[PDB]
Structures are given as structure tokens and as C-alpha cells.
């Protein structure tokens, strides 16, 4: 198409633009380097090269790819590791035997050797089709199929060619659409741009909770599925432990991991730790790696994968939410994407902004958090889906007043802090009562209380004991150890056992990863009834050590109740709490006398 006019630095200038848009990606020269036209000034177009420009001279042709810079969505995304630019990591590990993509890569974004069985849907010949309807289904998992074959956006017409059932590849076509003549060819996989979100029928308010398995996380401030959550990272404070524990202990059908500016060790530890550990949903043949999607880009790769990693993860999470499954988007971190966008903005020659970041970082960060959420499926088939955006926010430039952490903290309505002492203390997450907050706890308590919750009464009482013990610790330190009363020792003793039983979790057994809502609901009622019975027993005349020694195995069994199996009452309710309430009521009379 165009001719190379000049090459200065990492950016390339090409003239002879006769229709090349500023959103389409193409390869400059004969090396097939990754690049995209960022701007255009007259006949000469400005394209940013994210790869090595060695061996490029003036007078070379520029071949366009024929579409915008996006990623391919189809079968085979699970159980594979790729970059943000849709680069095959398993193909580079098979051919080159390395984890870094070389310069001049032009392979496809999906594997073509793994064939899948395509089954036809309820659509027949003669009926009109449209984007959003389920045209078929293809297996993508190791045991079952979860990738629903739907119509892509910007397409409609009649089904002129109906492919039958059988095994086919991604390159071979199985469907054809007829609209105004020869519109285009359809296959198993489809292309979609990463700069445009997936359209749906309508958006709804998120009221469903994320099945993770944290007793203190679900009990104190339960983050619902489909809300924006921000967490401050420290690069070693517990950010990778929450993603690794949330990926393995989580029982969701879909999972998307987005690595924008990681060092490389966390992507290899999370990638190698996935097939070794099993899941809680009874999966087999790599259930952790098959139900999760790996998108890991290091800090030494090009900025196109780091900047397009959030758009590829948001597009794959939008396609997974449009397919009807719930996917959790865990990203780390936004500071590497903001620094990668600021490096391309400063290298391209654009005007700078406050704090050295670009002016579009606030609109891209607001559009990235606003793109996720719970919504219905597009087209006529309405399905239930949710997209939880949990992105970490590390420091950039050695400051705390930048608009990245302040804009992400002010834009989000849920917060989960992480401390360096809490990660060393075996606490996950490292926030007890002052490091986390949530505004959607009213709807989450209305839905979880809508199923069969008793957490709505003990929700404020659970945080009230920790706030009373934390407020009493400063009065005990500054005022004196003998200034506290007997009720403060029972409240701090109940908050220590509730924080040690609920917040104290490091995956010691198989019951500390997956936690039901019934055990967390009865666990707060057992500690609330033990604190109320301890305060009422101490109010009638008794000692603190005489009351704790009078309790004994009743209070000691509540701390060791997490070690027991979760199938105590039917399959999820703890039966030790129901008899422990009457046992604590019978022990309350012996504790007073």
C-alpha cells in the first residue's frame, strides 16, 4: 500500500496513504513487524512500531492486515497462555522453545491443529438470523463445552448455507450468511476489535455475589459479581496470593487473568501452579487451567500487548459474559498499562499531561471500568452473565497523588487493601476493618439474604466487634491495661477468634479454599451468640478468665470449626453450629454460676 518515507527511532513514517485508517494494524517493510497507524499528517502517516526496527530502510511497502487491531475469539482460549496482542505462547514454546515472542511474528491468534466438534443449533433454513442468537456450540474445555457459537456483531440476513454436524477446524468455514449478496464467510472463530466493547441487549444492576470462598471477605464486605473493585498493590504485599487463591479456590465457570506489567515470575508461578492444583467444582483433566484464561505480558515485552491486554481481557470477558457464563477479570496492574501508554505517548511525540501520563488515561481508565459489569446477552436469547473487574493499582513515579490511583479509587465503589505485615501474617486479604470498604453490601445482603441469609443482622455486629476491639486497643495502649472493662476483653477475645477463624486462612486443608454462605452465616451467628452470651454471663457476675475457662471447648470448637468438613448438615450447612448454639445456651448457665 504505502511507501516508507523515513524511519527515525522506534516510530516509522510512511507516505502514500490512499485510504489507510488510523485504527487498522499493518506490517511495515518485509519483516512483518507489529504496528498501527496512531496519527496522520498529510500524505505521510505516523505509525508506532512496538518491535525492533533493525533492518528497515526507506522505500519498502506497507501491507495492511485488512481489519482493525483486535483479537480472535473462538474455541481453544482455555488451557493456553497468550499475550495482549493475541500472540501464541504455546506456538512460540513449541517452535522457538521460549516464553518471549520474537520480532517479526505473523502467526494467527489461535491454534488450528486442535479440532473441535461443531453442533448445529435450533436455527434452520428459511428463518432470518441476527447477531446475538446462538447459532451452534463447539467444545473448548477438556471435558465439557462452554464456548457457545453465536452470531458476531454487525451482521444479519438469512442462513443460505447450513453446515451439518461433525468435526471441523477454525480455518474451515461451517456457516455462511446471505445479506445483500455475498456478505462474508463465517467460521468457528471470529474477529472483534479491542477498542470497541461487545454490544448487548440491556444492562442490569449487579446483585449476585462472586463465588470465591473467603469467609472474612464474604462476611465483612462481600464484593458482588459485576462491580468495580480497586486494590492498592505494593509488588509483594499479597496481590498475587489473592489471584492465585481466587483462581484455584474460585468455583466460577470462566476466569480471565490479565498481566500487563508483571515481572514474569508471577506469570510463571500462576501458570505452573494452575495444572498442579485441583478445583472445588469437581473438575478433571486440568480443571483449574481449563476453566481459566491466561493472558500474561511481562515488563520486557512490547507496549502493544501491555496496552491491548486490558482491551483483550475486557473483550474476552465481554464475549464470555455474552455467552452466558460468569467470568472474573483479575488484572495486575493498571500502573504498568498507564506507564506503557505514557511511554508510547511520549515516544510518539504527543502533548503530555499532569504527572507525565497521557490525557486519554482517564477516559480509557473510566471506559475500562465502565465496560465491565453484569448484563444480559445480546440478540433475542437473553442469558445471565457477570463481569467482575478486580484490577490492582500499584504506585507509579514514587507518588501517591497521581490521577491513576486517585481516579481509580474515586471511580470505583469497592476497595480491598493489602498490607505487607498482613501477607507475612498469613492473612488473605490483609485488611481487617480499616483497609476495605464496599457500597454494594446492601444489594448483596438483600440477595444473599434473599436466598437464605442471616448475615443481615450480624453484618454490622461482625464489624462492630472488630471496630470496638481496634478502638479499645488504642485506649488500652495509651490509657492503660487496667482501664478496660470485662466486656472489652470478651469483645476483643471474640474479635480475635472471629478474625483468626475467618480472616486467618492460608489454605491449610481442602475446606479453607471453598467456603459456603451457610457456614459463614452460621459462623458469625455463633460468634455473635458467644459474644452476647459472654457479655450477658459477665454482666450477671463473673470473671474474664473464669468465663473463658467456663466456656472452654465451646469457644475452642468455634476456632477449630473451619478444619471440619463443610458437608455437616446437608452438603453446605455446618451442623456443629446448630448444636453449638444450644450447647452454648446450656453452657451459658454454667458459665455464670
Amino acid at each position: 500500500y504505502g511507501a516508507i518515507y523515513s524511519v527515525s527511532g522506534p516510530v516509522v513514517i510512511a507516505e502514500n496513504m490512499i485510504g489507510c485508517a488510523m485504527y487498522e494494524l499493518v506490517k511495515v517493510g518485509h519483516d512483518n513487524l507489529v504496528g498501527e497507524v496512531i496519527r496522520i499528517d498529510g500524505d505521510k502517516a505516523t505509525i508506532q512500531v512496538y518491535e525492533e526496527t533493525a533492518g528497515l530502510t526507506v522505500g519498502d511497502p506497507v501491507l495492511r492486515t485488512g481489519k482493525p487491531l483486535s483479537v480472535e475469539l473462538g474455541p481453544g482460549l482455555m488451557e493456553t497462555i497468550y499475550d495482549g496482542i493475541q500472540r501464541p505462547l504455546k506456538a512460540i514454546k513449541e517452535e522457538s522453545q521460549s516464553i518471549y515472542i520474537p520480532r517479526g511474528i505473523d502467526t494467527p491468534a489461535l491454534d488450528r491443529t486442535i479440532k473441535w466438534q461443531f453442533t448445529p443449533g435450533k436455527f434452520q433454513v428459511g428463518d432470518h438470523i441476527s447477531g446475538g442468537d446462538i447459532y451452534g456450540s463447539v467444545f473448548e474445555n477438556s471435558l465439557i463445552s462452554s464456548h457457545k457459537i453465536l452470531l458476531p456483531p454487525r451482521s444479519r440476513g438469512t442462513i443460505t448455507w447450513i453446515a451439518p454436524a461433525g468435526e471441523y477446524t477454525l480455518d474451515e468455514k461451517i456457516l455462511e450468511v446471505e445479506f445483500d449478496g455475498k456478505k462474508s464467510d463465517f467460521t468457528l472463530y471470529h474477529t472483534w476489535p479491542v477498542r470497541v466493547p461487545r454490544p448487548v441487549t440491556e444492562k442490569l444492576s449487579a446483585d449476585y455475589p462472586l463465588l470465591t470462598g473467603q469467609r472474612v471477605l464474604d462476611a465483612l464486605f462481600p464484593c458482588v459479581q459485576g462491580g468495580t473493585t480497586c486494590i492498592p498493590g505494593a509488588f509483594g504485599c499479597g496481590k498475587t496470593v489473592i489471584s492465585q487463591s481466587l483462581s484455584k479456590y474460585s468455583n466460577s465457570d470462566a476466569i480471565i487473568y490479565v498481566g500487563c506489567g508483571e515481572r514474569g515470575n508471577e506469570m510463571a508461578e500462576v501458570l505452573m501452579e494452575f495444572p498442579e492444583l485441583y478445583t472445588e467444582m469437581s473438575g478433571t483433566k486440568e480443571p483449574i487451567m481449563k476453566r481459566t484464561t491466561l493472558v500474561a505480558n511481562t515488563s520486557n515485552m512490547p507496549v502493544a500487548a501491555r496496552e491491548a491486554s486490558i482491551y483483550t481481557g475486557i473483550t474476552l470477558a465481554e464475549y464470555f459474559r455474552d455467552q452466558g457464563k460468569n467470568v472474573s477479570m483479575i488484572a495486575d496492574s493498571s500502573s504498568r498499562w498507564a506507564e506503557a501508554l505514557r511511554e508510547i505517548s511520549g515516544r510518539l511525540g504527543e502533548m503530555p499531561a499532569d504527572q507525565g501520563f497521557p490525557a486519554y488515561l482517564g477516559a480509557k481508565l473510566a471506559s475500562f471500568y465502565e465496560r465491565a459489569g453484569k448484563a444480559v446477552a445480546l440478540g433475542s436469547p437473553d442469558r445471565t452473565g457477570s463481569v467482575s473487574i478486580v484490577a490492582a493499582v500499584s504506585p507509579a513515579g514514587g507518588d501517591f497523588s497521581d490521577p491513576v490511583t486517585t481516579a481509580t479509587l474515586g471511580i470505583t465503589q469497592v476497595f480491598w487493601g493489602l498490607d505487607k505485615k498482613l501477607a507475612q501474617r498469613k492473612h488473605f486479604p490483609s485488611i481487617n476493618t480499616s483497609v476495605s470498604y464496599s457500597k454494594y453490601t446492601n444489594v448483596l445482603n438483600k440477595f444473599y439474604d434473599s436466598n437464605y441469609p442471616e448475615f443481615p443482622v450480624l453484618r454490622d455486629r461482625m464489624k462492630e466487634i472488630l471496630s470496638n476491639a481496634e478502638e479499645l486497643e488504642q485506649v488500652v495502649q495509651l490509657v492503660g491495661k487496667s482501664a478496660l472493662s470485662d466486656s472489652d476483653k470478651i469483645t476483643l477475645d471474640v474479635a480475635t477468634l472471629i478474625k483468626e477463624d475467618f480472616l486467618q486462612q492460608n489454605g491449610y486443608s481442602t475446606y479453607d479454599a471453598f467456603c459456603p454462605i451457610w457456614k459463614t452465616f452460621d459462623m458469625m451467628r455463633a460468634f455473635i451468640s458467644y459474644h452476647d452470651e459472654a457479655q450477658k454471663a459477665v454482666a450477671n457476675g463473673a470473671n474474664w478468665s473464669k468465663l473463658a475457662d467456663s466456656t472452654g471447648d465451646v469457644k475452642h470448637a468455634v476456632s477449630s470449626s473451619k478444619f471440619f468438613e463443610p458437608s455437616r448438615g446437608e452438603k453446605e450447612v455446618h451442623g456443629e453450629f446448630e448444636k453449638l448454639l444450644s450447647t452454648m445456651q446450656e453452657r451459658f448457665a454454667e458459665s455464670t454460676d
Binding site: H128, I129, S130, D133, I144, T201, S282, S380, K571
Partner: protein, 250 residues
């Protein structure tokens, strides 16, 4: 805009034709006559887009998704009850009861259909274990009782069968004693004489009776216990008296 309305009308007509091929639903098909009228005759995309551009047809995304959610839940509930069949009056009463409900996304009908669909999807690619056979028989009896009693009634047998199938689906490969003891306790706790008679085949009950007789067979080290345990292995149907008589021999 127009592609979601034309694809929603054609997908609603194709879903209504795929739901009932006999066309015996005059109550549900009576309300959808305005959408089936454009699909039962010659109507191009320009006529539906031109009629929808002037407000001569339904063009609301919330009303079209809410009206299509009842047909999607009815088609998913009628499709998840296979191979059993439901009556047309029961499907019309279930569609009329689901249409008159304010909540059609947060109700227990989609959670029960997703719970039965998880047991059917887990039973469609199950391994060679006895939990897939006992969960297949309990899912067949739960599908027969769910198709016979409807999704609008909250019976204790469908909740106990769904709780036993959900508890059996959460088990692992190192819990065969808990699945056999849970199947024996669930079969002995039923108030009927045989819950698999007239639902499952004789080979499916003979595989479970041969599984329990083969499980209790290795613990017998006597001639009287071997003859008494072998005397209960010639039956082709499963019952509570066979499990109670086999438990007394071991």
C-alpha cells in the same frame, strides 16, 4: 437496532416453533401473534425495519428482552426435562405463572433449571463410576417428578433429589463410600417401594444392584453369608428391601 428486532422476532418464531412443533399452545401463541404474523408470511428486513422505525411494532429492548426471557425460560425448562415430556396445559399454566411474576431473572426457576442442567451436563460426560449411574437414576427420577409436577410446585422430593444430585456432583474420586452410603440412605429414606420402577430400564437397576452386591460381596468370608449375599443378586430391580437385606448379611 433493527437487526436485534428482526433477529429477536425470527429467533422468537424459531424458538416458538422449536418449543412446540404441534402448535397446541393457543394461549402462549395468542400473545405472540404480532411477531409470528411477520414470520408466517412474506416479510423482508426492510419491511420490519421500516415498520419498526415508525413505531408500528415492538421496538423496546427491555420489553423485548423481558418478553423473550419467558420464552427462553420456557424453552430451557421444556428442553431440560428431556427425555420426559410435559403436558400442554401444564406448560401453559407454567408459562402463565412465569409470565405473571415480576422477577424472571432472580427467581428459583432459572436456578433449578441451571441445577438440573449442571447434573445433565455432568451426566453427559461422566466417568465410569457409580456416582454417574446413581446420579443418572436420581436425575431421571428428578426429571420425571419435575416434568410430572411442574416447576411451579416446590415439592420436597424434587428438592431432596436435587440436593442429593448436587451433593453427589460435588464429590470426588476418593469418596465412593460416601456416595454409596448417600445413595443407600437416600434410597432407604424414600417413602416409595421402588423409585426406579417404570422410569429407568432393568439394566440400570441391575447395574446398581450388581454394584451394591459387588461392593458388599468382597466383605463376605462365609458360606452362609456368600449364599445369602448371592441369593439377592438374581434380581433385576432395585428396592429398599434388597438393600436392607444386603446390609444385614454384611
Amino acid at each position: 437496532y433493527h437487526s436485534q428486532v428482526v433477529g429477536k422476532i425470527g429467533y422468537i418464531a424459531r424458538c416458538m416453533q422449536t418449543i412446540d412443533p404441534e402448535n397446541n399452545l393457543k394461549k402462549i401463541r395468542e400473545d405472540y401473534q404480532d411477531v409470528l404474523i411477520w414470520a408466517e408470511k412474506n416479510y423482508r428486513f426492510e419491511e420490519i425495519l421500516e415498520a419498526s422505525k415508525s413505531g408500528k411494532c415492538p421496538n423496546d429492548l427491555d420489553a423485548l428482552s423481558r418478553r423473550s426471557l419467558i420464552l427462553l425460560e420456557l424453552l430451557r425448562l421444556v428442553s431440560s426435562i428431556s427425555p420426559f415430556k410435559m403436558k400442554l396445559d401444564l406448560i401453559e399454566s407454567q408459562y402463565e405463572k412465569m409470565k405473571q411474576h415480576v422477577n424472571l431473572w432472580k427467581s428459583d426457576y432459572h436456578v433449578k433449571l441451571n441445577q438440573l442442567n449442571q447434573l445433565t451436563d455432568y451426566l453427559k460426560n461422566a466417568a465410569p463410576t457409580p456416582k454417574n449411574n446413581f446420579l443418572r437414576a436420581m436425575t431421571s427420577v428428578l426429571q420425571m417428578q419435575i416434568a410430572q409436577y411442574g416447576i411451579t410446585e416446590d415439592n420436597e422430593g424434587i428438592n431432596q433429589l436435587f440436593k442429593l444430585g448436587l451433593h453427589l456432583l460435588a464429590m470426588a474420586n476418593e469418596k465412593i463410600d460416601e456416595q454409596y452410603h448417600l445413595f443407600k440412605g437416600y434410597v432407604k429414606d424414600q417413602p416409595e417401594e421402588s423409585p426406579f420402577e417404570g422410569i429407568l430400564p432393568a439394566e440400570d437397576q441391575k447395574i446398581l444392584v450388581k454394584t451394591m452386591i459387588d461392593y458388599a460381596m468382597p466383605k463376605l468370608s462365609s458360606k452362609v453369608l456368600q449364599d445369602k449375599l448371592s441369593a439377592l443378586s438374581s434380581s433385576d430391580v432395585l428396592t429398599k428391601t434388597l438393600l436392607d437385606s444386603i446390609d444385614r448379611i454384611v
